Amino acid sequence: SITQLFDDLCEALLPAANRKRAKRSLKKVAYNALFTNLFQLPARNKILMLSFDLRVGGLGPKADRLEELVEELEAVGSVLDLLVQLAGSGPPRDYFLNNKHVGRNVPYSGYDCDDLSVFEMDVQSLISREECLCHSMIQETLQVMEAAPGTGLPTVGL
Amino acid sequence: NLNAVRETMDVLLEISRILNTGLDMETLSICVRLCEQGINPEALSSVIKELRKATEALK
Amino acid sequence: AAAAAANLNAVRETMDVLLEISRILNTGLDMETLSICVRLCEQGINPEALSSVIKELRKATEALK
Amino acid sequence: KSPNVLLQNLCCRILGRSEADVAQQFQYAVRVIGSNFAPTVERDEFLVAEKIKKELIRQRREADAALFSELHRKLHSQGVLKNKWSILYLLLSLSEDPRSYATLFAQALPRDAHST
Amino acid sequence: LHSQLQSLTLRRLLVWTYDPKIRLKTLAALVDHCQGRKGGELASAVHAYTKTGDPYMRSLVQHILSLVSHPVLSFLYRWIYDGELEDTYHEFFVASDP
């Protein structure tokens, strides 16, 4: 049902509410764009090149997880080759973290000051989020409260 | 077999979640089954990025 | 033009001097491999980490030979 | 290029293979290089120089210890090299003797004293 | 801490120096429990600090024990394989008679 699997795909990406002619026109954009590439390298390596860029900017264990799944997905190759293409298109606690004070046999470390320095940035981002909200909540409504009479109002636009 | 092809489809969602791909659960099974036909995946990367483009012009 | 050819000369010099320091120190590197390790060290990378890798891939190419 | 694609050329130079063949080693090279990217010791080419002379003198090769001093100046003469500490720190580590204790002698500073 | 004074304040120090308020709490109370102990009797009074359970202290003191008990295991591996005990100061628990 390859002629239908493109028809069901065009429904999901259609945002819910003419919804009867847009699907007819969006199926054109699906075909008008599918045959441009057709007119005109291993698989796991492309993940590692993205695994590297993970570890550099921190978040090591997540990168050790991305490789943990592709190792069990072996025991389909063309599917992961599609996900690596859309890697950047997406939209933008645990106390048993470092916590040298809990464990069975925790090894000697001495002060770190590189875990407490990335434990105050975990808090500084919190106070900087709940402050942009109050900057994006008093702005979205004062831009309407003070304007020309009848701009932001939809009933006056009739 | 449907128990196996469910697990193999469930693991594949996570590697598409941490790779920050916008594919939700429904569009994934559509694209997995469509890639399972034999279509070249280098082209599917363009239709999804364009369907999402013309979708934004509406909103 | 010219300033794009004067830079290709000042790089073939330095890549020829680093090959002299490489032989009097008796590193097993050659002119092709050494240009990879120089590029990496320009972006900023731990030479204590990068040298552990080369000391390993050269240590595994023998188990296969 | 980028360091991630550049690390794979290295695994193809040392091991003679194509990138579709050798992918277990390149999985081990991303593990070590990554999470160990930032330099850990204060950088100075002076200290690393006085350790490549001290090493070529120790092999009774006192003539090449004074030739290096003339090759290390030329590096500064041309000026296309930004990090001269790194490439020497590496060339020294891969050095083999054609033919003990190191907590007594001069070691690089730790960078832990500073608030990195 | 001194390089940043050129910004940090009092309330910012409390979090910076909240951990070294503990290591300087065990060590400053580990040198009083073993005051007059010399020789092995000291390596036995820095081991009575491991029965604590606190995962941060039991993994600190259990490291100082691994250094203090190195000389003790130096006589032992000497008085077992060679039988030549030598300690001008009386530390080993095997006392010889001239």
Residue for token digits 């808090």?
A: A123
Where do the H-state alpha helices sit in chain C?
6-24, 31-43, 47-64
Of D53, D60, D76, give the one whose Cα is nearest residue C25.
Answer: D53
| CA distances to A42, C48, D22, D29 from C51, in Å | 27, 6, 19, 11
Of A112, A3, A17, A122, give the one whose Cα is nearest residue A59.
Answer: A122
Residue for token digits 């990195």?
A: D116
- Give me D114's structure tokens: 């500073």
Structure method: cryo-EM
B4 part of contact set with chain A, CB < 8 Å: no
Which residues of chain C have a Cβ shorter than 8 Å from any chain D Cβ?
Answer: 7, 10-11, 13-14, 17-18, 20-22, 24-29, 32-33, 36-58, 60-61, 64
Cβ–Cβ gap D90/C41 under 8 Å: yes
Residue for token digits 């010399």?
A: E38
Of C45, C47, C4, give the one whose Cα is nearest residue C27.
Answer: C47
- Give me E28's structure tokens: 């400053």
Nearest CA in chain E to A119: E15
Give Cα D84 distance to the centre of its chain. 10
- DSSP label at E8? -
Show which of residues 1-40 on chain E sit within 8 Å of chain D, judged by CB atoms.
Answer: 1, 3-4
Q: What gap in Å lies between CA D72 and CA C41, rounded to an integer? A: 17
Cβ–Cβ gap D10/C53 under 8 Å: yes
Rg (CA), chain A: 25
Give Cα E42 distance to the centre of its chain. 9
Tell me the helix, strand and coil percentages in chain E, rounded to 5: 40, 0, 60
Contacts of C3 in chain D (CB under 8 A): none
3+ Cβ–Cβ pairs closer than 8 Å linking A and C: no
Q: What gap in Å lies between CA A143 and CA E37, rounded to an integer? A: 77
Show which of residues 57-116 on chain D sit within 8 Å of chain C, judged by CB atoms.
Answer: 64, 67-68, 71-72, 74-75, 78-83, 86-98
Cβ–Cβ gap E59/A120 under 8 Å: no
Q: What gap in Å lies between CA E67 and CA D43, rounded to an integer? A: 33
A17 part of contact set with chain B, CB < 8 Å: no
Q: What gap in Å lies between CA C20 and CA D97, rounded to an integer? A: 16
